[PDB]
Amino acid sequence: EDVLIPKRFRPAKDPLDSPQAAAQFLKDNKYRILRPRAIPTMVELETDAALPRLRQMVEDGKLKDTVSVPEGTTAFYPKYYPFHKPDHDEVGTFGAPDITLLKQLTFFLLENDFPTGPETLRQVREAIATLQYGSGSYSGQLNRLLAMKGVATGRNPNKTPKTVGYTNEQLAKLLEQTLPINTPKHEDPDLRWAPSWLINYTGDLSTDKSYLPHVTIKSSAGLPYIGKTKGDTTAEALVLADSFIRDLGRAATSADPEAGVKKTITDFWYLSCGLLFPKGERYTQVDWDKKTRNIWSAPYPTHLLLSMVSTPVMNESKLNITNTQTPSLYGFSPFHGGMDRIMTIIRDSLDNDEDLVMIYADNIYILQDNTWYSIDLEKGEANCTPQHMQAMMYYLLTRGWTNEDGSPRYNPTWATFAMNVAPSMVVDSSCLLMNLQLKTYGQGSGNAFTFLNNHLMSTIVVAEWVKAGKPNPMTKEFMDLEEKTGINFKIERELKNLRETIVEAVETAPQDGYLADGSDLPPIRPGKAVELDLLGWSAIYSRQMEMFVPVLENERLIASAAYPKGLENKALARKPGAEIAYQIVRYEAIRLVGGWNNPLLETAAKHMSLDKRKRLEVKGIDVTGFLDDWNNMSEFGGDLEGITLSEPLTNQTLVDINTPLDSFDPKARPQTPRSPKKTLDEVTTAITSGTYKDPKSAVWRLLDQRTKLRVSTLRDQALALKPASSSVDNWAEATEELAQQQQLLMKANNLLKSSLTETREALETI
């Protein structure tokens, strides 16, 4: 009645929703508040004047005729006041639990003796009663900042790779194994130009092209354009990103590179300050004001410049354990036989009594002693030092941005941005909340390098596990790697008696229903799942397909059923029939990702899906287009890219999403592009012995030296890289002689200072 349905959660009044109360709380907790910096007042300039090369893009309507730039004689302090919903005064449709589904689950439990039915109903009701989908609160966000600072500086303070004992080259040798990469396509431009110069526009569809990375148009522009999207500020971003990279390049080759580079960095300070966006999630009601995860929303120009380094490399590097002999999980999909490929790799390891490691950003998976371990970095991003990102930049510029002859696919200006400035713009820099400019501890979550920097930190933890003789994750010896690496982590899952569990999963596989005998019905009694929680997926054995298939981890499935995400796109929500199409999508997607294998959930969701489809026929609205392009309407859209929901879900839909394109032979997987014959273990034993301290390549040696020399030496460094980046006659011997020359002047300790510290100082100058 009103006892079955839990009461709606009404968040308490937030006592820290004012700058005074927020500042006092952070002060009482010793959290660093910066002296606020101001942005010059916006000036409405002619886009034709600011971007003359793109005059044709203005007249064709691809850019606004005016551009607003911070050039004014007066300045302003930026202010960012995000919405937190639901809140004490607004408990509406946003974050509303699916009470209709709870009613349906109860009715079908009344009529069906499903052995897992009572546990499914209780779990959905408990999730509705204890969880809340929403954007948390100011208190939640502020307490989260304290927890991040705690991971960075508390019980286990962060350590740079150098402090742990790795050079840039030693880390690169590990990343060749844990994150194998290819070079960007030959047709893609080198890192040598201003972003706007990557736009080739005239009108001709046969030639017109943009080599810039794809951006989310509806996402936040960030500073200095609060309240604007990326689509709203395209011209502004190009003008600002162009001016920053050009002013940096000029300043570095000026009569005083230290004063020049520092002036540019302070003039564009706001390019290092992220809007502290409250992340929409299924939070615990009891901890609503204790924890709101934060999205560090990078300014559009900073995101564009960073993405120009990473995305041309990563587009060509979808290499993982299912298609390459690497522990990496980058670009993994459990669909189209992905999960069965993983289960084949796991089963072969267990039969051959071999240990196994898998890495995905802040997620580590270890198979040892007939046990599966899921290890996650604790609040990952907070463990990142600017030096971790600098080591990733080294790896991308040496292994990615390199020609076949070994010459660099970048010039000194882009080597300066990537190595000497960029890591301090998004790591240990600052954020904006209300009128408060707060310190950021670690890397800003959501920045372009979030995955890459987290993947490098997990690589360090895994390399140290291999070095320590692979101690079991449940022992003190493994937990001691926290202090050894400066990286906090925790064992999130332990799946004991793995061999036996896989045998049980195969033997308990149902004979009835979906992917079993092929009828359009859930099994009465589902088989045992292999609860790997591999990027949120469990494995279930299919008798029909004779393979393991993925099912969304139970806790995630229940949370998503209890609190569905609605249409979080104003434009699509405005379109007619979209909201009623979303209703069908919600119940079909929950079935697709794994609800099909939960008999109570599948009976209730199928009913909801067909009843919503019947309501659509009554109103006479055609939503076929929306149901075909359902991906953008669902949180589960990012997987099943080529499936349509225009026809109701059947057993054939489940067969199709699990159909492999090719047969799998693990021995047939190509080796990594670099050091193919070497295993991660052989690389670790070499590093332990002191190998790969310095790269053999003089170009790479110059890039490593660049991480150690102060900003006043940048012009000399530019002269050292100029022959190689220009590919002049006999550049190799010239770069070789210039590196040897630069190595000698490095005996002057006064020339040794991290440019990353110099960047941070200038960013925080008043």
Partner: peptide
């Protein structure tokens, strides 16, 4: 073959 639009 490589896009070359002057470099920064």
């Amino acid at each position: 073959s490589r896009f070359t639009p002057g470099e920064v």
